[PDB]
Symmetry: D2
Subunit: 425 residues, 4 copies
């Protein structure tokens, strides 16, 4: 019943490989509030890593879950079907962008969704290679670790991950990688390592998550769509983190002016219950023969009803508009703090997928990982839970529930401001 006592028990019972960002054991939570085992209250700006866009235990979501719990929790869909799985698939087919008919597969984790999107693209194109981008993050299974553009620590010490995954550059002007450089890096793969006829898919996060909250511009995404179209390559949009409304539209691709062939989703789709999925061009989804897709827990009944309710909540509570309003208030406030702290070299974000990036004395070539970690620690001491990201660990991101109250927005920005003021001296 103390965080420290539980941390000691953790070190003796759980491998050190599972890191602990905050050495705190949560006991209960509601919307943006979390209480630890000692009764201390925190304001949650991490949202369980973008999983709680509708807040901890949204009452509508919980009541849907409680009703399903009276019916059944598991049959394994492939054995005996159930309606919540079917209804969610129909809804995702309508909401994921694309003017063609789509089909949806439900699985359980984001890594599984990416795994399956790739398998489907391979079966549909009869090709085996894939292309992913620098700083990308797609999961912790062997193949998704290969797709993830970061070896340490995700796959550190394990030897080489699966081959035949080629690396393109993610466009990022802030750090000198132009859209031209990014597209040229894909043609480079075609010419040097894997011809287009051997590439089943190009996988991309419309807004990189663990990679630093860097967004693709519609122009880049349009050139990418054209390049895939030219070569029969499937464009896979990994919206596990950017999806379920974080960017102000349900899916970030809606803001890109083009539709991907396959979209993966998870995290906030079910507001705190284990569910993930893949929605894409119906004929591409159907390339795999019966028995080729599935999973024991896939599309768990309770999680399906939670997701159907999350989508209803977005509509009833106009959370997309709130995401945009929230993002503006956050950026306005961070820009204000940036006026007094040159270390804040960039304030950015689509909708509520907001981040700031820190540099030693403002030099874009010197990521300040130290100040970043210090701000995360100081915030925690003030009762605010934050996460950093980026290949250089100098990006601070905000993933607070879209259901946050106005007073809490001011409260969080004030704490952050205090952390930077106090970090000096």
């Amino acid at each position: 019943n103390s965080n420290k006592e539980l941390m000691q028990r953790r070190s003796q019972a759980i491998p050190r490989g599972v890191g602990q960002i905050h050495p705190i054991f949560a006991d209960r939570a509601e919307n943006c509030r979390v209480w630890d085992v000692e009764g201390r209250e925190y304001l949650d700006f991490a949202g369980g890593i973008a999983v709680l866009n509708t807040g901890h235990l949204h009452p509508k979501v919980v009541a849907a879950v409680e009703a399903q719990l009276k019916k059944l929790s598991h049959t394994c869909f492939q054995v005996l079907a159930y309606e919540p799985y079917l209804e969610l698939c129909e809804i995702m087919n309508q909401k994921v962008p694309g003017d063609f008919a789509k089909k949806t597969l439900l699985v359980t984790t984001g890594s599984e969704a990416v795994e399956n999107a790739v398998k489907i693209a391979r079966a549909a194109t009869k090709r085996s290679g894939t292309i992913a981008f620098s700083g990308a993050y797609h999961g912790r299974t062997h193949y998704t670790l290969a797709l993830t553009g970061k070896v340490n620590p995700y796959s550190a010490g394990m030897g080489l991950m699966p081959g035949h995954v080629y690396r393109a550059l993610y466009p990022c002007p802030l750090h000198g990688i132009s859209e031209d450089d990014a597209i040229a890096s894909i043609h480079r793969i075609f010419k040097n390592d894997a011809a287009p006829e051997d590439i089943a898919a190009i996988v991309i996060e419309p807004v990189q998550g663990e990679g630093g909250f860097y967004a693709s511009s519609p122009a880049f995404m349009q050139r990418l769509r054209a390049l895939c179209d030219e070569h029969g390559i499937m464009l896979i949009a990994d919206e596990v983190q950017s999806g379920a409304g974080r960017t102000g539209t349900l899916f970030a691709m809606e803001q890109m002016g083009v539709a991907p062939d396959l979209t993966t989703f998870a995290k906030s789709i079910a507001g705190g219950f284990p569910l993930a999925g893949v929605t894409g061009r119906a004929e591409v989804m159907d390339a795999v023969a019966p028995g080729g897709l599935g999973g024991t827990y896939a599309g768990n009944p309770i999680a399906c009803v939670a997701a159907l309710e999350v989508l209803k909540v977005f509509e009833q509570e106009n959370l997309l508009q709130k995401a945009n309003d929230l993002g503006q208030k956050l950026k306005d406030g961070l820009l204000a703090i940036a006026e007094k702290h040159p270390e804040i070299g960039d304030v950015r974000g689509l909708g509520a997928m907001i981040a700031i990036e820190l540099f030693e004395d403002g030099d874009h070539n010197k990521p300040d990982a130290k100040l970043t970690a210090e701000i995360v620690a100081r915030a925690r001491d003030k009762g605010l839970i934050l996460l950093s990201c980026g290949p250089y660990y100098n990006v601070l991101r905000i993933l607070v529930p879209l259901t946050i109250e106005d007073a809490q927005i001011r409260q969080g920005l004030e704490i952050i401001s205090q952390c930077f003021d106090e970090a000096k001296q």
Copy 2:
């Protein structure tokens, strides 16, 4: 709201790759009973594919879940920890066989569990290759599809799965593969394709599941343990399906007389909620550096409290003894039926992990997949839900909850008896 209308909607919204064993939409369930959307009642001998050893919605499990729903459903353990994850790890470290210190990681699906056990073995041994057995089944991610000893349909049409996974023969006297043949096939790998110094682990199901309910003998497992010891190879016991009490002991390895270095578990561990994990020798588990293990939903709070309750139920309701008793009653009944049906060439199984195998005119080299499929269909028509398995699709398995009523044991065996009598008419 008829099964037919829902199947039509399925064809429009969900990929055909997700097979539908039974064209039925379940509406609600309780213990061993499932009711479809039309109100028809069925006896569930599939148990959601060995996930419901405590039955659908065990009341104790559901009450614990309902209580946790008033606290929190998700924080992402590696961000903010919580006690149910910790407690379950402590208990698994004690319950998994091996008289030495252990640690446990929780993830969400069985495939993720196997993925992590291999990543851990690789980090621990500083080697990259793995060996798996003929007919094995380990999951649907790219790497676990490579480990899985069956291409069609699991990875059919997708091109070749990850390399550096080698194939040994699973011992099966019924089909002419002796234990010597099995051990020799491992040495063959060492000599022809991958030396011991490049093999991080040998992955094996103590009792193959999708592969036909073929169990390893203690003598064979002991020879394997010695072979791994000699070469510094990690022995990974995949107990995703054999575990959580199906064979009469919590883990089948308990009946082998030797302990693995790592064990995967999932399915019945949480009685119908998404949870999986890996428990192993502490020093092996600790080989991965911080940040190297994780997952967004991993050890979901609700699923953890469900697992803790499943473990108490096993103890309180004497479910291990019941598994053994149930298995004896099932085999006795199946043997009686076999006296009248030569096609049943084998009746086998540890605990309640029971199966019968069909051969044309009891000819061991002639797998009778048509009869097997006919029995499954005749059983559904009589209200009994069964699954077949085996590389040749001729094994009928029984995975009915261990909480089955005495009358239902009689009912299922009687229905199976009628199916064989009516198929022979």
Copy 3:
């Protein structure tokens, strides 16, 4: 100028990885005679590892080489062509078995020939995987080491060789692998790891060379041809060692009753000059696009005229018949020796591809590698150069030139007899 001083210099200038079977420096040679730097004369029963079926420096071969040396030694065929390359390709299209149009590519080494046959099959079938057999030997490049069914020492310590090469069992009744077992091991790969639709070729040595001089029966080869036909898979006959007349026919496949799609050849094709090549069904050979095949030294002019002359010598000197006569004389003498030494557990071979296998106390389960090495060393001391082979290093092979004189046959057999008698004193 002494063998010992040259061996000391060798230890300082050349990697220990290049083994040295005999610590002798050859100075000159003629037909089956070799003289070292110390003037000692030896009888060559190794033939430079089956490279000298026409003997060291056959006078007709040397005369052709001398005539070509006056013209040119290299232009790179793909840059400026030359007639000897063209003429040899025309002849091999006719000589290689297969009653259909063929085309031929010339390269330089046997490993390059195998590499090319695989590249060609992959382009022809649009598939990436290959199957090779236990104990096979196909060369020392990364891919041919993967095809090679022996890790130690060929690829020992280098980490895992290229993936997507699967292992079947070579038929060998002497060691309990029946033809049914061999064919079943192929279906096992199709079911467990790589479907036929992903297998471009099955690569096989009609008579395994480094593997122990084990020969496929015509019945087995016919079943393999039927299996390949059914699945659109290319049958590649690696005749680098079995070819150029060693078995009594120019190519061993001629005795199998069926034709492969692709044949590799090297070693004795040019009687001691660097040349290798691939001959196959015309439509298969033409699947690779222009520029996809080549090599700097490929089809070297001097080696081409040497090969053209070697083929003429085979016709003029009736070497195919001599091979069969030599083989019988050798086997007869070896059988005579086996009557006094039970350790000789088998005497076998097609044509002049002769071997005996040694067992500790006639026990086929106890390969006698120590005695084998002892016989090689004793023979060397008596002036006879021999080589062993076999995955267990207990096979003595004879690859003496087909041009050997009758008295030398007796001389060699007598030496081997003395070696076994004295090893046993």
Copy 4:
């Protein structure tokens, strides 16, 4: 006889995959002249693709070959050794740059040399990955095709080549890739796809050959050497084409100011006879265990004496100085032609490794492959044999023997000058 008649026979007996740059069949050649079967005389500026630095059939080389031909042509060194192989290794150990003990392995082709250098690096570092550069060319075996930075046509239509080969950018200011971009691309691989501890070697051509005659600067090579040193990575200099004197020093690395760990050589090392090898840091070479290195024809006796004689000729005839003088005369002559032809956008090269690059309207972004091909064809009609190179096929390279006389230098430049004038007419 006729070139066209021979081309027709070629189309019927040889696969189209073997391209034919010049549809001409050579009959005889001497120094820089070649005569076809129609008796027409050509000036050879291709040198059999840089194999004839000492010219066709240098008399001293031929005399050495003739002397060896009276002794023996093949024993397979690893069976029975011979002095020429030993003597050549001793000399290469001292002449390849590196102020430390080296050992040398001889094989037969350049692709085999690169294959072995990587196998040796892998065994020495106990790592399996490699890094190669954009536009690189290393051979036609599966693994060297993966190293080769060009898919079409070298590995076109065959599916994906071996994985675990990562791609860095070769520095080339002319085309916008700075040295900083190049080094940053190596760090990118380390961070995104393969940690340094999994990279056995970085393979680089000091001057890219098929990639366009682009040379590394000493500054870049020094940074690359420092990066390899920091991470324990072996630096492999592929000097198969740049070596044996082409650049003015025996090996190009000598001009870089640093030594590689391993160097591959072939082509001009033996003046037109099949030989290749790897010379490197002794303890790295010795990391492979006995039996782990070899090859049937490896270090062929005749090619060894040819190479020993080529090295003496370089000394006796001052060929390195001549290569520098030749290079200057060529560049001066080409610059004069460039004053009248804007299409020639760059004239470059170290020593006699000279090239010019053609651009449409002198625009660096508009490679002129059509004009380049027209020049090669016109030059041939005028009796001058040329080759092009470069990933965009717009680089004309000159590889004429270093033994060329002044009159022929003038004559070849005049022919080239005419081709450009007549191309614009």
